[PDB]
Symmetry: D3
């Protein structure tokens, strides 16, 4: 089975019957695709395509990335699953695939990151630049993002060159994972597993946010945060202990 894919295809078929004028959109992006992988790469290439660099070139490059990284099949699905499990506003597997710029931005970064590591720096920067303009997510291609990442609303996200985000993290819009100013080498946050980072929060410097911690909306976080705590405020203070899942 591939239950995420089969659900997505059933939803697209229903969506098309319900609203025929969207048939070109839904067949080109889901129903004529032979796999979820090709559906996701297609949508993102179409959103990022421009006269400067066609959707085709983007999609063909994405194909080469998938070929080199079969593990992306798994990561992709855990990422879709993170949306489904963590966002009450949408009730379909199809929604992140078609609609959610946060989800698109994560996979775009995975592409840009892979290119950057191949020494295809320009392609990597081009995708960073286009993602920054169209998804409003400025993620440096050398950043490292884990799987099961949930990028909710996303607008205004900034992630620096040396930032690391571990698995099962949720990140709101307006979040900066950035540097302080005395910044040469390793200068951006390391975000551990199961963290939630609320809207507008700034996490600055080579500091750590410990496992399962929550950063309240609007915090400015300048010192490392221990595991299992809630921080809030400008500057941030521990305001509680917290759990995971």
């Amino acid at each position: 089975v591939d239950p995420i894919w089969h659900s997505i295809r059933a939803e697209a078929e229903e969506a098309t019957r319900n609203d025929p004028v969207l048939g070109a959109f839904l067949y080109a992006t889901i129903l004529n695709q032979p796999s979820l992988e090709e559906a996701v790469m297609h949508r993102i290439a179409e959103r990022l395509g421009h006269p400067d660099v066609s959707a085709d070139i983007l999609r063909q490059t994405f194909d080469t990335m998938l070929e080199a990284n079969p593990e992306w099949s798994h990561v992709l699905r855990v990422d879709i699953q993170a949306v489904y499990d963590r966002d009450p506003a949408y009730s379909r597997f199809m929604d992140p695939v078609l609609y959610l710029k946060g989800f698109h931005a994560i996979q775009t970064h995975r592409l840009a990151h892979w290119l950057y590591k191949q020494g295809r720096k320009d392609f990597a920067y081009y995708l960073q630049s286009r993602s920054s303009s169209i998804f409003q997510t400025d993620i440096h291609p050398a950043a490292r993002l884990g799987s099961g990442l949930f990028l909710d609303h996303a607008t205004g996200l900034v992630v620096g060159e040396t930032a690391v985000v571990e698995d099962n993290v949720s990140i709101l819009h307006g979040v900066t994972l950035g540097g302080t100013g005395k910044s040469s080498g390793d200068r951006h946050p390391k975000i551990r597993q199961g963290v939630l980072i609320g809207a507008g929060a700034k996490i600055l410097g080579n500091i750590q946010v410990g496992q399962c911690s929550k950063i309240a909306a609007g915090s400015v976080v300048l010192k490392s945060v221990p595991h299992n705590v809630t921080v809030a405020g400008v500057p941030a203070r521990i305001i509680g202990e917290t759990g995971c899942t």
Copy 2:
């Protein structure tokens, strides 16, 4: 009479004489249009059009919404009037129509909201997604927005599924009307009449901001705000009493 429309047409004619290369823009969007309604729907369809879903399809759908909601004629004009009366930076009725993504985003939501209520969920999400990418306004289609809404600068606005904004409200860029985390059902703010919400403010949870209240730039608002007060800070505190108009 229709003084907003007649002023807009006189401005466009003058603008065209003054700068002929913009004649195609100004005739296609204003001067060849038989009404303000068709001018507004045209501009917004053109800004939102994409290979995925043409400007035409968007404009035709907008036409069906107007046909089903003749009250939008009135709402549209009070919305234009809110810009004219509340923003010193522009002195023309034409400016919101042509230029102001906040104004475009409000009417886009009105379209998406109507579609959502018709059971055209995908179209609704598609427009939410496109508005989030192009206008940087992420408004859930189930949100409810009153008339005489002023969306100034707009970039980064987020409005949740169960948020309600009442009439004659002004909202700056960077504003979140969102949820806290213990969020099942009704979980997003209710904004009463005549409120001003300043840049970067986050209003979180199923809480109310009372009539004529002001939220200072950068506030994190976690508790309901009574009528006629100014709140400021992280977290927000009452810092004064205030009036309307």
Copy 3:
């Protein structure tokens, strides 16, 4: 010599050999151009072009601006130099030219500002509107920006009509240079030389930020800031003395 230009051409040639599919991008924008000026105006016109107003019309208008302002040759280069000297994340003169929406937004404003002063108000607003949508930078065309301006990440920048930014300033994303509310005439900040303004900061009213001062990420600045100090917090407080360069 023109060492910035010659370095940019050598980088583009190398980039093209390294990744041939980007040859159309890199030749159209750099290598077939006879000057850095024409390269910069071309990239920005291509990013801002739309069915509403073609990249060609934008580029031709840009040409007229350069012809009227030969000083832009110098300003452009000091602006590129500000990126090179102040951002560790990129190591090429070519990077701002091709990729950095902040850099594109600054020159876009310089164009819009010049048009505004010519009485080509609509063109000016059109470019403000398009820059606000594509670069997420909302800069009123009557704003005044000095040279050696560094707009890092840029997303969500708002600059009001009467704001003045002097030379050698660095500005992060999420920054508002805006008004308080009792705002008739001169109502927006004046930013002096060598200032750094951190992510998310709001500077509100006709107040001054003195030379070489630093505004920490997330500050709400409501009172004028003296020279050579660091301010932080909501509301902002002096937290230190600081220097320039």
Copy 4:
């Protein structure tokens, strides 16, 4: 229940478009945006043609808005386009649907594009008219001077390579194939292109040259070069053309 509520051409086209969408849903954007969302056949035809001619140089929208202006000034276009559609339906065995010319056949799209251009030209909007002529020549391969006069119930079958000069006149119920020139001898000044009478068929690749008349109900065989006026009710063939027989109308 006024007489103009009778419109079997539009209703069949709406039914055919919906059935097409069910059977091939990927075509739904095309068929809804061009037919099913339109409140009239006039608006569907204007939209189709506008989209075919649309270019970064002059948008489909500007073309469609200009078409709207033409219809408002020329109400008879509603009947003319219906008779032109009926011509295809009656005269071409290769297509079974009223929808076929509306969506597909560049001859039908060229005819209405000329009607638009012709109106614009008479209004003193000569650049708009030449622009349409230019775009029609490039996309429909039909180079029709905007001063040319074309009747109704015109069937432009296949159409590729059609040239019609400035002073040509084509009357009602004519059928014209691809590769046809209604042109000049090259040796006169004013009135200098052909006058085609009602009911004429002009075969593929025919050149008709000069201020000459093709008489009513006559037929021009494929590849004829026609240099002298043709009487009514004959077939001509050959290079140059000669009467090869007698013919009737309908």
Copy 5:
């Protein structure tokens, strides 16, 4: 090292495309996206053709995905397109490369577009088929009815102005020039367009009209009008056409 690993046509095309890019790097986006990034000649041809026919009305993507469906259902298309490419290579002195038809020659693009349309038409997808016919008529200037039957090793040289009727049959190894009509007399109902046998050459501007046969290995001189069946192994010329001599194949 199965037999179908032998593919000198694809390998030469890959080499020619890479050499072209080195020599003229601004063409790198075109040549990589159309040839060098593709894992097969089939995918390059589908991509090229999809991009040429693509329009806001129906995207290149939808066309390319539909092409993919045709290849999956018609595996023989892999050999057919290779023989069609080999026809150009063998029969046109003006071009030296297998890559020339794949990228440039609208006759070759039209042939495969017809193959797609023909398959769709037989599947009951008649709107898709007419849409392709319509788009091919406008962009390649080749108006080929989707019910027409076209053999392999077809060379459509220059192509502009080609018209092929609904009941036409063209067999293998035919060469057809621009301005050619395989059409009707206008006076019959069912089977009514030409049957072209193997090895035939049809010269520029020829009209072949009626349910008539052009016999094997025969040649139709430029500008001929052909109204009667042509026996094998002759050349015909003239208006109307007459046997002017004897001819062999190859």
Copy 6:
């Protein structure tokens, strides 16, 4: 006040474009971006042609930048394009303005596109050249081999269906109509296409086939098939062509 400051063609075009905009302001984007914002006629012509040929496959910009390179290497193009414009103005009654070929007439756009392609081909940039030939065939319906040689003061009237072979030569002051082939007999190897001398007029649909010469000032009637060299100062007509009379130049 050097001699090359005299440019009545450019100045009339600038005046005509501005007057057009006042009269029909919706055309302002087109006319300003193509004429009024340009600092030279060369730049207007390059821009117009680049925009017509532009495609996602190779942008108008790349085409315009490549045109710029051609002009820089071939300064005589400034005079050639002006004589080509003057040819239309002098030879076509249907248009009254120097601006008409620059904006509208695909024959004029094809000629300059060939000039670009021809230069590229001689530079070893054969893919670029074939790409332009391919795009011109599809958008202007003029299939001109880049190795063909075309003189100045060429008038390509209507143009649809033009085919010119690899070894064709056309000298100065020629007028050529639509449906014209300067092609091959199909039976030779090297030099194999026509040599057209100065002052020739070639009528619509004419096929001129072989390494044959059309003598100076001669005229080819519409629909002629020309298989033998034509002496100077005659008119030929027919299938095949025969001398039908005597003719002079101008």
